[PDB]
Amino acid sequence: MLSGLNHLTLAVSQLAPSVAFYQQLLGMTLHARWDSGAYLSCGDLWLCLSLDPQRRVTPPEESDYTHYAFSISEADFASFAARLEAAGVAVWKLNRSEGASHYFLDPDGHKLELHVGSLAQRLAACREQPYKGMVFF
Amino acid sequence: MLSGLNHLTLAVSQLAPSVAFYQQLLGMTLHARWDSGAYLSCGDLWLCLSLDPQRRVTPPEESDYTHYAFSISEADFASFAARLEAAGVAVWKLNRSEGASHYFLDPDGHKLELHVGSLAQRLAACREQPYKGMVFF
Ligand SMILES: O=S(=O)(NCc1ccco1)c1ccccc1F
Ligand SMILES: [Br-]
Ligand SMILES: [Mn+2]
Ligand SMILES: [Mn+2]
């Protein structure tokens, strides 16, 4: 039986700027670094950056909607978004759903998000205003 | 600050086969579906499958090393991996370069992994068998 997400691994084209992005800009904790990768944590999340020459710096129009959302409190959301904007981090989408969301790109074009709100909150909102074809289990 | 992974969203090309893969084959909990997506949980992980006409079925030699690992216990690991193998689930990696892991593909080629062990356990193992150039902070 699967018990949760064990780790998220992102392929990166250049290790130093990716470590800087996740550790310094996004505030994650750096636990280890080697010639071809790094391990960081963000709360319970184990993040691995893996240096991969096959990683392309990918414009957002050229990747699908796969994306990785990080939790932040409502109280901290706007100042963290402003930090990303000061650093020149590109946005790939505007929020049109429930719960605050800021959609931003990492140096290689990985699609990231800051989101406020849980699955339970989303399900409650959907129960009140179901999407087209929505079924609950 | 950022406190963990709020959710993982995977773009999928065909919704019902992907829901079946994550719910039936991997055992995750299905909470809701709609015409363009589904919400599942795996322990504390919120997984969203998003129907995306841009998603392509991607062979593993065509994608980089970005991947998603799910936690499984030492007692359950081998029989779960063997069940995926017997079910014909495609693979993408054989060499255990980060501990006890089984590497397999979802229907669209998303790179998945079963892994036994925490970040702390992986750091302890790496102190004895470090990756080249490894430094610990
Ligand atoms: O809309 S459903 O009830 N979704 C639930 C589902 C899909 C895969 C696993 O659970 C459905 C769609 C298509 C075929 C069968 C169905 F049960
Ligand atoms: Br469905
Ligand atoms: Mn999202
Ligand atoms: Mn892994």
PDB file of C-alpha atoms and ligand atoms in Angstrom:
ATOM      1  CA  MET A   1       0.000   0.000   0.000  1.00  0.00           C
ATOM      2  CA  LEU A   2       1.285   3.443  -0.901  1.00  0.00           C
ATOM      3  CA  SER A   3       1.454   5.849   2.011  1.00  0.00           C
ATOM      4  CA  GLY A   4       2.271   9.217   0.424  1.00  0.00           C
ATOM      5  CA  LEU A   5       4.677  11.071  -1.802  1.00  0.00           C
ATOM      6  CA  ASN A   6       8.174   9.905  -0.978  1.00  0.00           C
ATOM      7  CA  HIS A   7      10.067  12.480  -3.048  1.00  0.00           C
ATOM      8  CA  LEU A   8       9.794  14.801  -6.030  1.00  0.00           C
ATOM      9  CA  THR A   9      12.768  14.817  -8.400  1.00  0.00           C
ATOM     10  CA  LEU A  10      13.250  17.662 -10.856  1.00  0.00           C
ATOM     11  CA  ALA A  11      15.717  17.352 -13.713  1.00  0.00           C
ATOM     12  CA  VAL A  12      17.789  20.539 -13.971  1.00  0.00           C
ATOM     13  CA  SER A  13      20.120  21.817 -16.676  1.00  0.00           C
ATOM     14  CA  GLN A  14      22.437  23.807 -14.365  1.00  0.00           C
ATOM     15  CA  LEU A  15      22.798  22.750 -10.750  1.00  0.00           C
ATOM     16  CA  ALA A  16      24.027  26.001  -9.184  1.00  0.00           C
ATOM     17  CA  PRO A  17      21.155  28.293 -10.273  1.00  0.00           C
ATOM     18  CA  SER A  18      18.606  25.606  -9.453  1.00  0.00           C
ATOM     19  CA  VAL A  19      20.020  25.165  -5.936  1.00  0.00           C
ATOM     20  CA  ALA A  20      19.961  28.947  -5.552  1.00  0.00           C
ATOM     21  CA  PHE A  21      16.337  29.118  -6.738  1.00  0.00           C
ATOM     22  CA  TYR A  22      15.029  26.453  -4.362  1.00  0.00           C
ATOM     23  CA  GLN A  23      17.262  27.218  -1.360  1.00  0.00           C
ATOM     24  CA  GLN A  24      17.791  30.982  -1.454  1.00  0.00           C
ATOM     25  CA  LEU A  25      14.785  32.334  -3.348  1.00  0.00           C
ATOM     26  CA  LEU A  26      12.171  29.798  -2.228  1.00  0.00           C
ATOM     27  CA  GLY A  27      13.675  29.206   1.232  1.00  0.00           C
ATOM     28  CA  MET A  28      13.953  25.421   1.183  1.00  0.00           C
ATOM     29  CA  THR A  29      16.498  23.653   3.355  1.00  0.00           C
ATOM     30  CA  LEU A  30      19.565  22.257   1.594  1.00  0.00           C
ATOM     31  CA  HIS A  31      20.641  18.955   3.149  1.00  0.00           C
ATOM     32  CA  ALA A  32      23.237  17.665   0.698  1.00  0.00           C
ATOM     33  CA  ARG A  33      24.780  18.406  -2.677  1.00  0.00           C
ATOM     34  CA  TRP A  34      26.960  16.273  -4.947  1.00  0.00           C
ATOM     35  CA  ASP A  35      28.489  16.712  -8.374  1.00  0.00           C
ATOM     36  CA  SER A  36      25.191  15.880 -10.112  1.00  0.00           C
ATOM     37  CA  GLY A  37      22.396  16.765  -7.715  1.00  0.00           C
ATOM     38  CA  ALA A  38      21.076  18.033  -4.429  1.00  0.00           C
ATOM     39  CA  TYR A  39      18.612  17.097  -1.710  1.00  0.00           C
ATOM     40  CA  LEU A  40      16.370  19.748  -0.147  1.00  0.00           C
ATOM     41  CA  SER A  41      13.341  19.703   2.096  1.00  0.00           C
ATOM     42  CA  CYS A  42      10.285  21.914   2.292  1.00  0.00           C
ATOM     43  CA  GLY A  43       8.213  20.836   5.264  1.00  0.00           C
ATOM     44  CA  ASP A  44       7.594  17.115   4.695  1.00  0.00           C
ATOM     45  CA  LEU A  45       8.560  17.364   1.027  1.00  0.00           C
ATOM     46  CA  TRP A  46      11.801  15.695   0.001  1.00  0.00           C
ATOM     47  CA  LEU A  47      12.957  17.459  -3.163  1.00  0.00           C
ATOM     48  CA  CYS A  48      15.781  16.132  -5.310  1.00  0.00           C
ATOM     49  CA  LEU A  49      17.421  18.259  -7.999  1.00  0.00           C
ATOM     50  CA  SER A  50      19.116  15.997 -10.538  1.00  0.00           C
ATOM     51  CA  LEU A  51      21.575  17.451 -13.046  1.00  0.00           C
ATOM     52  CA  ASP A  52      20.459  16.095 -16.407  1.00  0.00           C
ATOM     53  CA  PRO A  53      21.922  17.180 -19.774  1.00  0.00           C
ATOM     54  CA  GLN A  54      18.622  16.055 -21.341  1.00  0.00           C
ATOM     55  CA  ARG A  55      16.709  18.772 -19.477  1.00  0.00           C
ATOM     56  CA  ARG A  56      15.611  21.503 -21.887  1.00  0.00           C
ATOM     57  CA  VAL A  57      14.869  25.024 -20.704  1.00  0.00           C
ATOM     58  CA  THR A  58      11.262  24.746 -21.761  1.00  0.00           C
ATOM     59  CA  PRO A  59       8.899  27.644 -22.506  1.00  0.00           C
ATOM     60  CA  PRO A  60       5.513  27.214 -20.809  1.00  0.00           C
ATOM     61  CA  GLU A  61       3.643  27.111 -24.116  1.00  0.00           C
ATOM     62  CA  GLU A  62       5.699  24.009 -24.960  1.00  0.00           C
ATOM     63  CA  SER A  63       4.986  21.923 -21.864  1.00  0.00           C
ATOM     64  CA  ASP A  64       1.750  20.381 -20.672  1.00  0.00           C
ATOM     65  CA  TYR A  65      -0.156  21.305 -17.501  1.00  0.00           C
ATOM     66  CA  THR A  66       1.834  19.014 -15.185  1.00  0.00           C
ATOM     67  CA  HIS A  67       2.806  21.152 -12.215  1.00  0.00           C
ATOM     68  CA  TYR A  68       3.936  21.185  -8.588  1.00  0.00           C
ATOM     69  CA  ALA A  69       2.158  23.319  -5.984  1.00  0.00           C
ATOM     70  CA  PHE A  70       3.691  24.350  -2.650  1.00  0.00           C
ATOM     71  CA  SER A  71       1.674  25.235   0.425  1.00  0.00           C
ATOM     72  CA  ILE A  72       1.825  28.700   1.954  1.00  0.00           C
ATOM     73  CA  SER A  73      -0.461  30.456   4.390  1.00  0.00           C
ATOM     74  CA  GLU A  74      -2.895  33.098   3.212  1.00  0.00           C
ATOM     75  CA  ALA A  75      -1.117  35.620   5.439  1.00  0.00           C
ATOM     76  CA  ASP A  76       2.255  34.960   3.751  1.00  0.00           C
ATOM     77  CA  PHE A  77       1.020  34.576   0.148  1.00  0.00           C
ATOM     78  CA  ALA A  78       1.158  38.152  -1.148  1.00  0.00           C
ATOM     79  CA  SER A  79       4.633  38.938   0.183  1.00  0.00           C
ATOM     80  CA  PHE A  80       6.020  35.684  -1.247  1.00  0.00           C
ATOM     81  CA  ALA A  81       4.460  36.439  -4.627  1.00  0.00           C
ATOM     82  CA  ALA A  82       6.001  39.926  -4.457  1.00  0.00           C
ATOM     83  CA  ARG A  83       9.414  38.368  -3.689  1.00  0.00           C
ATOM     84  CA  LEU A  84       9.153  36.200  -6.796  1.00  0.00           C
ATOM     85  CA  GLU A  85       8.094  39.236  -8.848  1.00  0.00           C
ATOM     86  CA  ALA A  86      11.028  41.286  -7.541  1.00  0.00           C
ATOM     87  CA  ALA A  87      13.367  38.439  -8.561  1.00  0.00           C
ATOM     88  CA  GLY A  88      11.895  38.519 -12.072  1.00  0.00           C
ATOM     89  CA  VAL A  89      10.321  35.071 -11.904  1.00  0.00           C
ATOM     90  CA  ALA A  90       7.933  34.505 -14.790  1.00  0.00           C
ATOM     91  CA  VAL A  91       4.240  33.702 -14.326  1.00  0.00           C
ATOM     92  CA  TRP A  92       2.661  31.058 -16.553  1.00  0.00           C
ATOM     93  CA  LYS A  93      -1.065  31.387 -15.658  1.00  0.00           C
ATOM     94  CA  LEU A  94      -3.482  33.655 -13.783  1.00  0.00           C
ATOM     95  CA  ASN A  95      -5.594  32.267 -10.947  1.00  0.00           C
ATOM     96  CA  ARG A  96      -9.285  31.627 -11.730  1.00  0.00           C
ATOM     97  CA  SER A  97     -10.036  28.859  -9.151  1.00  0.00           C
ATOM     98  CA  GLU A  98     -10.783  28.809  -5.420  1.00  0.00           C
ATOM     99  CA  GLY A  99      -7.957  29.505  -3.028  1.00  0.00           C
ATOM    100  CA  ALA A 100      -5.112  31.876  -3.699  1.00  0.00           C
ATOM    101  CA  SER A 101      -2.677  30.600  -6.324  1.00  0.00           C
ATOM    102  CA  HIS A 102       0.451  32.092  -7.908  1.00  0.00           C
ATOM    103  CA  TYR A 103       1.722  30.197 -10.962  1.00  0.00           C
ATOM    104  CA  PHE A 104       5.444  30.619 -11.587  1.00  0.00           C
ATOM    105  CA  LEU A 105       8.309  28.989 -13.482  1.00  0.00           C
ATOM    106  CA  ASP A 106      11.622  27.597 -12.264  1.00  0.00           C
ATOM    107  CA  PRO A 107      14.842  28.260 -14.199  1.00  0.00           C
ATOM    108  CA  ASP A 108      14.259  25.259 -16.484  1.00  0.00           C
ATOM    109  CA  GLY A 109      10.576  25.964 -17.003  1.00  0.00           C
ATOM    110  CA  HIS A 110       9.216  23.540 -14.432  1.00  0.00           C
ATOM    111  CA  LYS A 111       5.675  24.694 -13.699  1.00  0.00           C
ATOM    112  CA  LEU A 112       5.275  25.647 -10.048  1.00  0.00           C
ATOM    113  CA  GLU A 113       2.461  27.081  -7.966  1.00  0.00           C
ATOM    114  CA  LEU A 114       1.943  28.638  -4.556  1.00  0.00           C
ATOM    115  CA  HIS A 115      -1.479  27.547  -3.281  1.00  0.00           C
ATOM    116  CA  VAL A 116      -3.509  28.271  -0.164  1.00  0.00           C
ATOM    117  CA  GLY A 117      -6.014  25.558   0.657  1.00  0.00           C
ATOM    118  CA  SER A 118      -6.371  21.820   1.127  1.00  0.00           C
ATOM    119  CA  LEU A 119      -8.066  19.051  -0.812  1.00  0.00           C
ATOM    120  CA  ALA A 120     -10.875  19.148   1.758  1.00  0.00           C
ATOM    121  CA  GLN A 121     -11.418  22.853   1.046  1.00  0.00           C
ATOM    122  CA  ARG A 122     -11.483  22.222  -2.697  1.00  0.00           C
ATOM    123  CA  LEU A 123     -13.934  19.327  -2.348  1.00  0.00           C
ATOM    124  CA  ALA A 124     -16.240  21.446  -0.180  1.00  0.00           C
ATOM    125  CA  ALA A 125     -16.249  24.209  -2.788  1.00  0.00           C
ATOM    126  CA  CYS A 126     -16.902  21.663  -5.549  1.00  0.00           C
ATOM    127  CA  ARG A 127     -19.815  20.137  -3.637  1.00  0.00           C
ATOM    128  CA  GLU A 128     -21.455  23.564  -3.529  1.00  0.00           C
ATOM    129  CA  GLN A 129     -20.653  24.393  -7.179  1.00  0.00           C
ATOM    130  CA  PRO A 130     -19.798  21.178  -9.029  1.00  0.00           C
ATOM    131  CA  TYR A 131     -17.729  21.260 -12.179  1.00  0.00           C
ATOM    132  CA  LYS A 132     -19.300  19.911 -15.362  1.00  0.00           C
ATOM    133  CA  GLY A 133     -19.683  16.160 -15.043  1.00  0.00           C
ATOM    134  CA  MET A 134     -18.636  16.088 -11.411  1.00  0.00           C
ATOM    135  CA  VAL A 135     -19.156  12.888  -9.435  1.00  0.00           C
ATOM    136  CA  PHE A 136     -18.043  12.335  -5.841  1.00  0.00           C
ATOM    137  CA  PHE A 137     -16.942   9.042  -4.279  1.00  0.00           C
TER     138      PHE A 137
ATOM    139  CA  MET B   1       7.323  30.387   4.193  1.00  0.00           C
ATOM    140  CA  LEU B   2       6.674  27.346   2.029  1.00  0.00           C
ATOM    141  CA  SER B   3       5.567  24.364   4.061  1.00  0.00           C
ATOM    142  CA  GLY B   4       5.460  21.372   1.707  1.00  0.00           C
ATOM    143  CA  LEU B   5       3.781  20.083  -1.409  1.00  0.00           C
ATOM    144  CA  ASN B   6       0.198  21.273  -1.591  1.00  0.00           C
ATOM    145  CA  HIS B   7      -0.637  19.083  -4.582  1.00  0.00           C
ATOM    146  CA  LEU B   8       0.849  17.262  -7.545  1.00  0.00           C
ATOM    147  CA  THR B   9      -0.961  17.761 -10.868  1.00  0.00           C
ATOM    148  CA  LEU B  10      -0.311  15.361 -13.721  1.00  0.00           C
ATOM    149  CA  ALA B  11      -1.514  16.148 -17.214  1.00  0.00           C
ATOM    150  CA  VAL B  12      -3.167  13.095 -18.759  1.00  0.00           C
ATOM    151  CA  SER B  13      -4.250  12.329 -22.315  1.00  0.00           C
ATOM    152  CA  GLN B  14      -7.178  10.013 -21.452  1.00  0.00           C
ATOM    153  CA  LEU B  15      -8.900  10.580 -18.139  1.00  0.00           C
ATOM    154  CA  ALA B  16     -10.593   7.275 -17.361  1.00  0.00           C
ATOM    155  CA  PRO B  17      -7.537   5.070 -18.056  1.00  0.00           C
ATOM    156  CA  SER B  18      -5.404   7.320 -15.884  1.00  0.00           C
ATOM    157  CA  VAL B  19      -7.928   7.337 -13.046  1.00  0.00           C
ATOM    158  CA  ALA B  20      -8.046   3.552 -13.265  1.00  0.00           C
ATOM    159  CA  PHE B  21      -4.258   3.335 -13.128  1.00  0.00           C
ATOM    160  CA  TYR B  22      -3.894   5.475 -10.013  1.00  0.00           C
ATOM    161  CA  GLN B  23      -7.003   4.191  -8.207  1.00  0.00           C
ATOM    162  CA  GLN B  24      -7.275   0.528  -9.237  1.00  0.00           C
ATOM    163  CA  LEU B  25      -3.684  -0.436  -9.935  1.00  0.00           C
ATOM    164  CA  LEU B  26      -1.835   1.785  -7.464  1.00  0.00           C
ATOM    165  CA  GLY B  27      -4.559   1.775  -4.800  1.00  0.00           C
ATOM    166  CA  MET B  28      -4.943   5.510  -4.326  1.00  0.00           C
ATOM    167  CA  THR B  29      -8.213   6.924  -3.035  1.00  0.00           C
ATOM    168  CA  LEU B  30     -10.514   8.521  -5.611  1.00  0.00           C
ATOM    169  CA  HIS B  31     -12.486  11.464  -4.195  1.00  0.00           C
ATOM    170  CA  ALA B  32     -14.041  13.064  -7.246  1.00  0.00           C
ATOM    171  CA  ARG B  33     -13.970  13.187 -11.009  1.00  0.00           C
ATOM    172  CA  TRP B  34     -15.354  15.600 -13.587  1.00  0.00           C
ATOM    173  CA  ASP B  35     -15.263  15.842 -17.354  1.00  0.00           C
ATOM    174  CA  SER B  36     -11.725  17.263 -17.318  1.00  0.00           C
ATOM    175  CA  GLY B  37     -10.016  15.829 -14.235  1.00  0.00           C
ATOM    176  CA  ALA B  38      -9.980  13.887 -11.023  1.00  0.00           C
ATOM    177  CA  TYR B  39      -8.871  14.300  -7.432  1.00  0.00           C
ATOM    178  CA  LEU B  40      -7.189  11.433  -5.583  1.00  0.00           C
ATOM    179  CA  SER B  41      -5.225  11.102  -2.381  1.00  0.00           C
ATOM    180  CA  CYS B  42      -2.307   8.881  -1.432  1.00  0.00           C
ATOM    181  CA  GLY B  43      -1.854   9.300   2.297  1.00  0.00           C
ATOM    182  CA  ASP B  44      -1.488  13.056   2.724  1.00  0.00           C
ATOM    183  CA  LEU B  45      -0.701  13.625  -0.977  1.00  0.00           C
ATOM    184  CA  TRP B  46      -3.318  15.454  -3.022  1.00  0.00           C
ATOM    185  CA  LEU B  47      -3.020  14.179  -6.589  1.00  0.00           C
ATOM    186  CA  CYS B  48      -4.867  15.908  -9.411  1.00  0.00           C
ATOM    187  CA  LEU B  49      -5.186  14.298 -12.837  1.00  0.00           C
ATOM    188  CA  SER B  50      -5.911  16.994 -15.416  1.00  0.00           C
ATOM    189  CA  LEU B  51      -7.183  16.089 -18.876  1.00  0.00           C
ATOM    190  CA  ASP B  52      -4.887  18.020 -21.215  1.00  0.00           C
ATOM    191  CA  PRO B  53      -5.029  17.810 -25.033  1.00  0.00           C
ATOM    192  CA  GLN B  54      -1.349  18.829 -24.979  1.00  0.00           C
ATOM    193  CA  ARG B  55      -0.244  15.727 -23.053  1.00  0.00           C
ATOM    194  CA  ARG B  56       1.630  13.253 -25.213  1.00  0.00           C
ATOM    195  CA  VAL B  57       2.341   9.624 -24.444  1.00  0.00           C
ATOM    196  CA  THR B  58       6.068   9.957 -23.994  1.00  0.00           C
ATOM    197  CA  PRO B  59       8.631   7.151 -24.156  1.00  0.00           C
ATOM    198  CA  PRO B  60      11.124   7.294 -21.289  1.00  0.00           C
ATOM    199  CA  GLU B  61      14.110   7.888 -23.569  1.00  0.00           C
ATOM    200  CA  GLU B  62      12.378  11.102 -24.746  1.00  0.00           C
ATOM    201  CA  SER B  63      11.843  12.624 -21.281  1.00  0.00           C
ATOM    202  CA  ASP B  64      14.289  13.853 -18.680  1.00  0.00           C
ATOM    203  CA  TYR B  65      14.786  12.379 -15.203  1.00  0.00           C
ATOM    204  CA  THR B  66      11.945  14.331 -13.524  1.00  0.00           C
ATOM    205  CA  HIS B  67       9.980  11.742 -11.559  1.00  0.00           C
ATOM    206  CA  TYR B  68       7.546  11.156  -8.700  1.00  0.00           C
ATOM    207  CA  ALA B  69       8.221   8.603  -5.972  1.00  0.00           C
ATOM    208  CA  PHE B  70       5.600   7.088  -3.670  1.00  0.00           C
ATOM    209  CA  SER B  71       6.333   5.684  -0.235  1.00  0.00           C
ATOM    210  CA  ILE B  72       5.868   2.004   0.496  1.00  0.00           C
ATOM    211  CA  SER B  73       6.944  -0.086   3.437  1.00  0.00           C
ATOM    212  CA  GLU B  74       9.774  -2.602   3.385  1.00  0.00           C
ATOM    213  CA  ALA B  75       7.224  -5.371   3.976  1.00  0.00           C
ATOM    214  CA  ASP B  76       5.029  -4.387   0.999  1.00  0.00           C
ATOM    215  CA  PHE B  77       7.647  -3.225  -1.550  1.00  0.00           C
ATOM    216  CA  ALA B  78       8.589  -6.433  -3.344  1.00  0.00           C
ATOM    217  CA  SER B  79       5.096  -7.847  -3.796  1.00  0.00           C
ATOM    218  CA  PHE B  80       3.755  -4.502  -5.062  1.00  0.00           C
ATOM    219  CA  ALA B  81       6.621  -4.191  -7.557  1.00  0.00           C
ATOM    220  CA  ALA B  82       6.074  -7.789  -8.692  1.00  0.00           C
ATOM    221  CA  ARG B  83       2.352  -7.168  -9.159  1.00  0.00           C
ATOM    222  CA  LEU B  84       3.065  -4.151 -11.379  1.00  0.00           C
ATOM    223  CA  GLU B  85       5.521  -6.266 -13.389  1.00  0.00           C
ATOM    224  CA  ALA B  86       3.015  -9.087 -13.787  1.00  0.00           C
ATOM    225  CA  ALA B  87       0.413  -6.537 -14.916  1.00  0.00           C
ATOM    226  CA  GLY B  88       2.683  -5.429 -17.758  1.00  0.00           C
ATOM    227  CA  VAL B  89       3.476  -1.957 -16.412  1.00  0.00           C
ATOM    228  CA  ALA B  90       6.355  -0.475 -18.415  1.00  0.00           C
ATOM    229  CA  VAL B  91       9.556   0.517 -16.752  1.00  0.00           C
ATOM    230  CA  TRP B  92      12.192   3.084 -17.165  1.00  0.00           C
ATOM    231  CA  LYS B  93      15.071   2.281 -14.836  1.00  0.00           C
ATOM    232  CA  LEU B  94      16.705  -0.792 -13.331  1.00  0.00           C
ATOM    233  CA  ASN B  95      19.823   0.343 -11.429  1.00  0.00           C
ATOM    234  CA  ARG B  96      19.119   1.153  -7.767  1.00  0.00           C
ATOM    235  CA  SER B  97      21.127   4.337  -7.481  1.00  0.00           C
ATOM    236  CA  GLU B  98      19.085   5.802  -4.578  1.00  0.00           C
ATOM    237  CA  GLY B  99      18.199   2.778  -2.427  1.00  0.00           C
ATOM    238  CA  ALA B 100      15.315   0.339  -2.629  1.00  0.00           C
ATOM    239  CA  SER B 101      13.242   1.577  -5.561  1.00  0.00           C
ATOM    240  CA  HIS B 102      11.123   0.268  -8.429  1.00  0.00           C
ATOM    241  CA  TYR B 103      10.841   2.548 -11.469  1.00  0.00           C
ATOM    242  CA  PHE B 104       7.718   2.372 -13.607  1.00  0.00           C
ATOM    243  CA  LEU B 105       5.686   4.427 -16.078  1.00  0.00           C
ATOM    244  CA  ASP B 106       2.085   5.651 -16.017  1.00  0.00           C
ATOM    245  CA  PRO B 107      -0.056   5.386 -19.171  1.00  0.00           C
ATOM    246  CA  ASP B 108       1.265   8.697 -20.511  1.00  0.00           C
ATOM    247  CA  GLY B 109       4.870   7.986 -19.612  1.00  0.00           C
ATOM    248  CA  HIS B 110       5.007   9.972 -16.396  1.00  0.00           C
ATOM    249  CA  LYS B 111       8.034   8.592 -14.537  1.00  0.00           C
ATOM    250  CA  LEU B 112       6.978   7.025 -11.255  1.00  0.00           C
ATOM    251  CA  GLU B 113       8.814   5.190  -8.504  1.00  0.00           C
ATOM    252  CA  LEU B 114       8.106   3.045  -5.458  1.00  0.00           C
ATOM    253  CA  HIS B 115      10.672   3.830  -2.752  1.00  0.00           C
ATOM    254  CA  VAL B 116      11.357   2.448   0.720  1.00  0.00           C
ATOM    255  CA  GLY B 117      12.826   4.984   3.115  1.00  0.00           C
ATOM    256  CA  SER B 118      12.891   8.603   4.234  1.00  0.00           C
ATOM    257  CA  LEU B 119      15.246  11.461   3.404  1.00  0.00           C
ATOM    258  CA  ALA B 120      16.955  10.960   6.761  1.00  0.00           C
ATOM    259  CA  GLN B 121      17.522   7.286   5.942  1.00  0.00           C
ATOM    260  CA  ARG B 122      18.858   8.165   2.490  1.00  0.00           C
ATOM    261  CA  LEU B 123      21.279  10.696   3.975  1.00  0.00           C
ATOM    262  CA  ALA B 124      22.507   8.100   6.482  1.00  0.00           C
ATOM    263  CA  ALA B 125      23.027   5.551   3.711  1.00  0.00           C
ATOM    264  CA  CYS B 126      24.833   8.164   1.617  1.00  0.00           C
ATOM    265  CA  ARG B 127      27.283   8.914   4.406  1.00  0.00           C
ATOM    266  CA  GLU B 128      28.563   5.341   3.937  1.00  0.00           C
ATOM    267  CA  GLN B 129      28.069   5.171   0.149  1.00  0.00           C
ATOM    268  CA  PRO B 130      28.094   8.788  -1.001  1.00  0.00           C
ATOM    269  CA  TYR B 131      27.379  10.058  -4.466  1.00  0.00           C
ATOM    270  CA  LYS B 132      30.510  11.499  -6.136  1.00  0.00           C
ATOM    271  CA  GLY B 133      31.520  14.778  -4.538  1.00  0.00           C
ATOM    272  CA  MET B 134      28.814  14.638  -1.889  1.00  0.00           C
ATOM    273  CA  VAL B 135      28.753  17.246   0.896  1.00  0.00           C
ATOM    274  CA  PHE B 136      26.333  17.193   3.833  1.00  0.00           C
ATOM    275  CA  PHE B 137      25.012  20.357   5.464  1.00  0.00           C
TER     276      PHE B 137
HETATM  277  O1  LIG C   1     -16.991   8.734 -14.169  1.00  0.00           O
HETATM  278  S1  LIG C   1     -16.654   7.491 -13.545  1.00  0.00           S
HETATM  279  O2  LIG C   1     -17.552   6.913 -12.592  1.00  0.00           O
HETATM  280  N1  LIG C   1     -15.238   7.706 -12.810  1.00  0.00           N
HETATM  281  C1  LIG C   1     -14.762   6.736 -11.827  1.00  0.00           C
HETATM  282  C2  LIG C   1     -13.557   5.995 -12.269  1.00  0.00           C
HETATM  283  C3  LIG C   1     -12.877   5.909 -13.424  1.00  0.00           C
HETATM  284  C4  LIG C   1     -11.805   5.012 -13.205  1.00  0.00           C
HETATM  285  C5  LIG C   1     -11.902   4.612 -11.935  1.00  0.00           C
HETATM  286  O3  LIG C   1     -12.977   5.204 -11.328  1.00  0.00           O
HETATM  287  C6  LIG C   1     -16.351   6.340 -14.861  1.00  0.00           C
HETATM  288  C7  LIG C   1     -15.954   6.814 -16.104  1.00  0.00           C
HETATM  289  C8  LIG C   1     -15.676   5.912 -17.119  1.00  0.00           C
HETATM  290  C9  LIG C   1     -15.791   4.552 -16.901  1.00  0.00           C
HETATM  291  C10 LIG C   1     -16.187   4.070 -15.664  1.00  0.00           C
HETATM  292  C11 LIG C   1     -16.457   4.973 -14.666  1.00  0.00           C
HETATM  293  F1  LIG C   1     -16.730   4.509 -13.428  1.00  0.00           F
HETATM  294 BR    BR C   2     -13.320   9.413 -15.000  1.00  0.00          BR
HETATM  295 MN    MN C   3      -2.575  23.502  -9.200  1.00  0.00          MN
HETATM  296 MN    MN C   4      13.688   8.811  -7.121  1.00  0.00          MN
END
